Structure 1
Amino acid sequence: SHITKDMLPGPYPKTPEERAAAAKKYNMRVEDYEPYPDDGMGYGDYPKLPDRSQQERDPWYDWDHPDLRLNWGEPMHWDLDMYIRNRVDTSPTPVNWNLMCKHLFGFVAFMLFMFWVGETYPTYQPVGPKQYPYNNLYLERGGDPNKEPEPVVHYEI
């Protein structure tokens, strides 16, 4: 079964008995129990963890749950459904984050600006239009069987 007092009403105050009860309840260090705090967003009294924790926990420890890095008794950070590996991988990046975003935005902006410079300035090999034989190839475009002849010719050059 399950004890009624293994649920969790109310935030931190007051500090002796409630923090002692949460240390006995969530199985944590006493002064490492951190409520969020109480801004009234719900959230109960559930702990704050170091929040990344899943490209951490180096995989040679040989714990119990092999694809979750569990150990059956950790207090299990609130946003765990966003933190199973296959969902969000917060690895320590090989460079930065600001350097990443600035260089990516700079490269894509420069390439799109060069695309616009291309779009205003075409190439063409120096050659006039084709010499379509019957009035810019009339009677074989969209229709017009006997409506209007459209006289335009070509001269040998």
Structure 2
Amino acid sequence: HVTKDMFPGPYPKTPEERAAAAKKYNMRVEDYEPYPDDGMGYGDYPKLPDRSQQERDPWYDWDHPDLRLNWGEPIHWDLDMYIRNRVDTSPTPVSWNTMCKHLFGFVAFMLFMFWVGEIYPSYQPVGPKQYPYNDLYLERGGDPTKEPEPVVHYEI
């Protein structure tokens, strides 16, 4: 039960055309800004702010409380990206750049120190363990018809 005019249309250079589209999408004429006329097929669809959908007012009486949406309002091109079940752009207590710097620094320092500790291992002042029968030759692999070189152990 929807007319042809209601459906999305190609990006319009003219102001009169722009005004018609802004009225169609139920938003103010100077509040409407389409995607740039590039090769991609956005056409005549408003470029709503990339503001997420988790951080909408949680106390407003939305028509769809779970999605935080109102009936009839324009829908973001990437709503399925922001449904509170996926990526959200909620402002964080610490800046994004400093968060990335701190996390990368911690991980890199941990890796470097693990490698350094691998270079300088830790052990105890003991000699290698001694096993009686030719370093347990028969019990490790077998091959009894080869008569391996016999290793003797030094009592001290």
- TM-score scaled by structure 1? 0.92
Q: Distance in 1 between matches of 2:58 and 2:5?
A: 31
Q: Distance in 1 between matches of 2:16 and 2:25?
A: 14
1:147 positional shift: 1.6
Q: Distance in 1 between matches of 2:56 and 2:148?
A: 81
Tell me whether 54-63 or 78-87 shows the greater mean CA deviation. 54-63
Tell me whether 82-91 or 10-19 shows the greater mean CA deviation. 10-19
Q: Distance in 1 between matches of 2:64 and 2:133?
A: 79
Please list every run of at least 4 consecutive aligned residues from structure 1 whose deviation after the TM superposition is greater than 2 angstroms: 2-17
Q: Distance in 2 between matches of 1:15 and 1:108?
A: 53
1:127 positional shift: 0.3
| Percent identical residues | 94
Q: Distance in 2 between matches of 1:57 and 1:51?
A: 12
- Report the secondary structure of 2:99's partner residue: helix
Structure 2, unmatched stretches of 5+, are none
Contact between 1:27 and 1:74, CA under 8 Å: does it hold in 2?
yes
1:55 positional shift: 2.8
Structure 1, unmatched stretches of 5+, are none
- Report the secondary structure of 1:76's partner residue: coil
Contact between 2:52 and 2:90, CA under 8 Å: does it hold in 1?
no
1:155 positional shift: 2.1
Paired residues in the alignment total 156
Describe the superposition over 1:88-114 as per-residue Cα deviations: whole angstroms up to 9, x where unpaired: 121101110000000111111111110
1:9 positional shift: 5.4
Once superposed, what is the RMSD of the aligned Cα atoms? 1.5
- Report the secondary structure of 2:110's partner residue: helix
Report the CA distance shift for 1:24/1:47 in structure 2 as closer, same or farther (over 3 A).
same
- TM-score scaled by structure 2? 0.92
1:3 positional shift: 3.2
Q: Distance in 2 between matches of 1:16 and 1:107?
A: 53
- Counterpart in the other structure of 2:153: 154
- Report the secondary structure of 1:71's partner residue: coil
Report the CA distance shift for 1:152/1:5 in structure 2 as closer, same or farther (over 3 A).
same
1:140 positional shift: 0.8
Q: Distance in 2 between matches of 1:61 and 1:9?
A: 29
- Report the secondary structure of 1:116's partner residue: helix
Contact between 2:48 and 2:76, CA under 8 Å: does it hold in 1?
yes
Q: Distance in 1 between matches of 2:148 and 2:11?
A: 90
1:150 positional shift: 2.2
1:78 positional shift: 0.2
Question: Are positions 1:116 and 2:97 aligned together?
Answer: no
Q: Distance in 2 between matches of 1:10 and 1:38?
A: 12
Describe the superposition over 1:22-59 as per-residue Cα deviations: whole angstroms up to 9, x where unpaired: 12211001111111111020112110111123132121
1:8 positional shift: 4.1
- Counterpart in the other structure of 2:56: 57
- Report the secondary structure of 2:115's partner residue: helix
